[PDB]
């Protein structure tokens, strides 16, 4: 019975599905990171602008 | 073949496995890293809300 060996073969097949799926995910994180940093900076910009006589920046 | 290709093929599958484990780790790191950025974001939004009461 290679039935035990055969099953091992597709677990390997599955392993390279899950691998392929992890890398696609990891790629999604990279773009998501790029989008979130833009978001944080915009929020920071809002605060900066909003800071009306409660704080002060650009100070030598 | 026997000495063989097969052997190299087996190693090649082993690299695939450690590469899977690596990716799964790095994705988990991203999750935590992102959760913390969300904490920062929520704080930023709380700050903006407060700051916007003085604009009123």
């Amino acid at each position: 019975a290679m039935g035990s060996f055969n099953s091992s073969i597709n677990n390997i097949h599955e392993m390279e599905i899950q691998l392929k799926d992890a890398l696609e995910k990891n790629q999604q994180w990279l773009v998501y990171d790029q989008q979130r940093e833009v978001y944080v900076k915009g929020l920071l910009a809002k605060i900066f602008e909003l800071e009306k006589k409660t704080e002060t920046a650009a100070h030598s | 073949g026997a000495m063989g290709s097969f052997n190299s093929s087996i190693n090649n599958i082993h690299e695939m496995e450690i590469q899977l484990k690596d990716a799964l780790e790095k994705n988990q790191q991203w999750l935590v890293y992102d959760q913390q950025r969300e904490v920062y974001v929520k704080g930023l939004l709380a700050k903006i809300f407060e700051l916007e009461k003085k604009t009123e």
């Binding site: 990171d33 | 590469q19 690596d22 990716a23 994705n27 991203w30």
Partner: peptide, 13 residues
């Protein structure tokens, strides 16, 4: 070529 975060803890820009 999988990549993790720049560092384990988040540091704002």
């Amino acid at each position: 070529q999988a990549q993790g975060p720049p560092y384990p803890t988040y540091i704002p820009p």
